Design an enzyme around this catalytic site. Sequence first.
Site, PDB file in Angstrom:
ATOM      1  N   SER A  41       0.868  -1.190   0.000  1.00  0.00           N
ATOM      2  CA  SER A  41       0.000   0.000   0.000  1.00  0.00           C
ATOM      3  C   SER A  41       0.902   1.237   0.000  1.00  0.00           C
ATOM      4  O   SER A  41       1.773   1.332  -0.881  1.00  0.00           O
ATOM      5  CB  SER A  41      -0.987  -0.127   1.169  1.00  0.00           C
ATOM      6  OG  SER A  41      -1.818   1.019   1.298  1.00  0.00           O
ATOM      7  N   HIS A  84      -7.576  -5.731  -1.015  1.00  0.00           N
ATOM      8  CA  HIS A  84      -6.346  -5.091  -0.564  1.00  0.00           C
ATOM      9  C   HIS A  84      -5.754  -5.764   0.670  1.00  0.00           C
ATOM     10  O   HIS A  84      -6.389  -5.803   1.729  1.00  0.00           O
ATOM     11  CB  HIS A  84      -6.646  -3.615  -0.275  1.00  0.00           C
ATOM     12  CG  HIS A  84      -5.430  -2.759  -0.090  1.00  0.00           C
ATOM     13  ND1 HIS A  84      -4.485  -2.578  -1.080  1.00  0.00           N
ATOM     14  CD2 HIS A  84      -5.039  -1.977   0.949  1.00  0.00           C
ATOM     15  CE1 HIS A  84      -3.548  -1.752  -0.645  1.00  0.00           C
ATOM     16  NE2 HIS A  84      -3.863  -1.370   0.580  1.00  0.00           N
TER      17      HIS A  84
END
Length: 520
Positions: A185, A442
Amino acid sequence: DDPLLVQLPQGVLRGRDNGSYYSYESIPYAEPPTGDLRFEAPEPYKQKWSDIFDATKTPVACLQWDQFTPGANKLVGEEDCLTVSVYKPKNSKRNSFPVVAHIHGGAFMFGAAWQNGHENVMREGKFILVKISYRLGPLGFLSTGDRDLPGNYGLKDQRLALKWIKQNIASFGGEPQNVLLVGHSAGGASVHLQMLREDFGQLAKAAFSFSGNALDPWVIQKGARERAFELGRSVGCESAEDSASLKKCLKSKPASELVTAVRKFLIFSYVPFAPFSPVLEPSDAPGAFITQDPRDVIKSGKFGQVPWAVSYVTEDGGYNAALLLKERKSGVVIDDLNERWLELAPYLLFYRDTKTKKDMDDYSRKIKQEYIGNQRFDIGSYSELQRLFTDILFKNGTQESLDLHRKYGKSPVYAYVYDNPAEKGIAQVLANRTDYDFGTVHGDDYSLIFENSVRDVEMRPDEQIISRNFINMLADFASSDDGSLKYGECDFKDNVGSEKFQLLAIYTDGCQNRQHVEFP
């Protein structure tokens, strides 16, 4: 205490025996960035030690407005936080290891070294791990766009930690010539940003960016200057009309007040999720981290020419589209987008500062039509909206990074897409529910490498295999002489020299290289 004690320039520290690995934690690599050192470049740690440093305490989190702390008050951490933590496998047969350097994610706003578990990688025992801590939110990334408050303090913190690793990791048994920099991320975006420095090859042998890169629209952002004075207005600094007096006034406030004021930037739950982020610095700020659009850096060829891999997962945009399925009394949050789409889509998809109001609304209409068509916003069209988030937030920037590196760089460049939904992940937390199959969200892949509290404690049988595959993939990459990269039974195919993109597809029970004109 032969293995527990380590000699550094400042003196000796004592670590901890954890059974299967040794840990040397909370080693400061810079002077505390407090008081007059707030909103300044990190200063190398200069203190000398007269006693044995106690390296047995969990690294503290940087003072932050943490999205995933529940409650009105999301302030956690400490301002004095610039620390590296070293984790070395215990092995009577082996005392030299390659090195994986780790930059935690969290949107440049929150997150922590300690939330990225090291048990999985220590159990496999094939490298030393170094977790880097760095300044976050306004403390790490406030910017007025000029040389008095240029920004990118958190990226300069990471780079100084990288120098620390080069200088000192051999005292721990690490091979400084075999350093692999990884992150997820915002960590993956940071890794790419570090790689874009011309001398990055002197700091690492290779890099891996998971679901984050320098071209994602939440990474390098415009509009920071007005956000900075907006922060000033929320903390009693409305009278400052220039950068230097804004900086002076902001430094006169307790750090906890500055970080708590992050809440004033969040106009829909934790939206936008990166009100403070990397920026381009001006050419007259010395020691600037980045002064050119990263696309132009890549085209120049003037970046660390090391092997790099970049990845995403098929429903990556579950962060943070899943907050739209959170139920209320009145209905579900996504219902509001039927009226608020033009207002909120620029914040949710990070084009509010790069387009005129007219072009902004045209693009909001355009992308809604292409992904949603004439459907109303509800749970039935959520999957198409999540696909939009996946594309704009994560996938398109992966494809454009790969495209520029394969054309303008000579080093091998690799990529994978992961499709293997976890039992639970970040989407169940955002939506506060378990009755919807979000897909591969994610962090579903990265959590198999560095375990955390968001996924299940126990890994499914297929995930245990995938986890070992990923960990060995990173180990071999850090030691590789030729820059090759392998997951399980599949060599990654280099994208340099191929017309089509070469994208390794990883799934529950295998993997396969696929070729694409555009990412699927």
